Amino acid sequence: QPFIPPPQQTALTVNDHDEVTVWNAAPCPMLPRDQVYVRVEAVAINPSDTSATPWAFLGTDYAGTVVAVGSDVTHIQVGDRVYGAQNEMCPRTPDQGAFSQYTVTRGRVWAKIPKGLSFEQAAALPAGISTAGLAMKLLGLPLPSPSADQPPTHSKPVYVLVYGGSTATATVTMQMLRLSGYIPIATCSPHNFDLAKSRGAEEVFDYRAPNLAQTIRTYTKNNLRYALDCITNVESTTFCFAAIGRAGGHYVSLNPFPETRKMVTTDWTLGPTIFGEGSTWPAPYGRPGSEEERQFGEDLWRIAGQLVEDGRLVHHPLRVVQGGFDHIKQGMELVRKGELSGEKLVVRLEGP
Numbered sequence: 001q002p003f004i005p006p007p008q009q010t011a012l013t014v015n016d017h018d019e020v021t022v023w024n025a026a027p028c029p030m031l032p033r034d035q036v037y038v039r040v041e042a043v044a045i046n047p048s049d050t051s052a053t054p055w056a057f058l059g060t061d062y063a064g065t066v067v068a069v070g071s072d073v074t075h076i077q078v079g080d081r082v083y084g085a086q087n088e089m090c091p092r093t094p095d096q097g098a099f100s101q102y103t104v105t106r107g108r109v110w111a112k113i114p115k116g117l118s119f120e121q122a123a124a125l126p127a128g129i130s131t132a133g134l135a136m137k138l139l140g141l142p143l144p145s146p147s148a149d150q151p152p153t154h155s156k157p158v159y160v161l162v163y164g165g166s167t168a169t170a171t172v173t174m175q176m177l178r179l180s181g182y183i184p185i186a187t188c189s190p191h192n193f194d195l196a197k198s199r200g201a202e203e204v205f206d207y208r209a210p211n212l213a214q215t216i217r218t219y220t221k222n223n224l225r226y227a228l229d230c231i232t233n234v235e236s237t238t239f240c241f242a243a244i245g246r247a248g249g250h251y252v253s254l255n256p257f258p259e260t261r262k263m264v265t266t267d268w269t270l271g272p273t274i275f276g277e278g279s280t281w282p283a284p285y286g287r288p289g290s291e292e293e294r295q296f297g298e299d300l301w302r303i304a305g306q307l308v309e310d311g312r313l314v315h316h317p318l319r320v321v322q323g324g325f326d327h328i329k330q331g332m333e334l335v336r337k338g339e340l341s342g343e344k345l346v347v348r349l350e351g352p
């Protein structure tokens with residue numbers, strides 16, 4: 001009954017000459033006493049996968065079948081299905097990444113898949129849930145209550161601009177914003193208008209429209225105080241700053257931002273902080289680990305896991321590919337080239 005990991009496996013990594021590589025003799029991680037061992041069934045592709053520690057495993061989003069259980073783990077059994085996030089390309093843990101045949105759960109940044117979800121649907125969620133939570137925390141917005149019967153009331157609407165309303169992150173975030181009593185207003189391309197509205201946007205606009213920031217300022221009564229930038233380029237930053245109200249506001253982006261007097265505070269989400277383990281980027285010093293960041297991730301996942309279970313948080317629309325590891329490599333290229341719109345690339349792994 002003791003579990004012994006396989007001697008080697010296939011995983012996706014980067015080699016010594018900056019090329020994405022299928023490695024067929026990759027190591028298998030050891031099983032922590034407080035984690036479970038996962039035979040990965042599906043993975044999702046994220047832009048951050050495509051942005052190096054050679055030979056460390058790639059990939060964030062996984063869903064799979066529990067094949068072994070740590071001695072200190074309760075409430076999980078062999079055969080259970082789980083989904084969660086890995087901390088990709090981490091030099092201290094190069095044998096942990098979503099793009100492997102076998103991984104281990106990390107922290108408490110995971111949950112059991114609800115009976116009603118498939119592996120493919122569940123794999124689509126982890127980075128979205130994680131990022132949505134970090135963005136709400138940085139904006140100074142409370143996470144939803146999983147136990148409440150309706151959102152908090154605001155007789156005077158509290159708007160949140162979401163620049164890039166068709167992004168995988170925005171569609172999960174806008175649902176959470178709604179649950180917490182906020183009213184998201186989104187910008188994206190016309191063909192994704194229905195998607196954005198279905199995911200919680202009160203109104204949606206084409207970001208290309210002339211003088212759109214004036215339109216938004218007027219809509220929000222010149223008091224927009226929250227802007228979430230899911231695109232993070234020179235144009236999106238300029239736009240969000242122009243839309244924020246006359247008295248100031250808070251800009252949060254999902255990436256570090258390029259190079260005002262506008263009374264705007266600023267932050268950006270650092271993905272590895274969902275684990276509270278720290279980060280070696282950005283130099284100098286990166287970030288330390290912290291128990292408060294760790295506890296926030298666990299709390300977020302306990303809340304989001306229930307919301308997913310209850311059908312209150314739905315996955316981004318899926319583009320599913322049946323395949324193996326070369327299909328992940330291929331998926332990453334489609335994503336890197338900006339070739340996906342309003343969909344998440346998920347690969348369902350064939351064994352063998």
Ligand SMILES: NC(=O)c1ccc[n+]([C@@H]2O[C@H](COP(=O)([O-])OP(=O)(O)OC[C@H]3O[C@@H](n4cnc5c(N)ncnc54)[C@H](OP(=O)(O)O)[C@@H]3O)[C@@H](O)[C@H]2O)c1
Nearest residue numbers: 047048131166167168169188189192230254271340341342
């Ligand atoms: N730091 C982190 O841990 C972290 C986590 C999650 C995401 N991110 C970052 O957030 C960004 C979005 O990632 P995601 O996975 O949420 O989204 P995604 O699904 O890859 O977003 C794709 C959408 O972005 C829109 N888009 C692309 N370029 C645009 C531009 N120049 N102006 C306006 N819209 C543009 C398009 O929407 P339309 O076709 O509708 O125009 C496209 O469909 C990426 O840069 C990613 O690196 C970072």
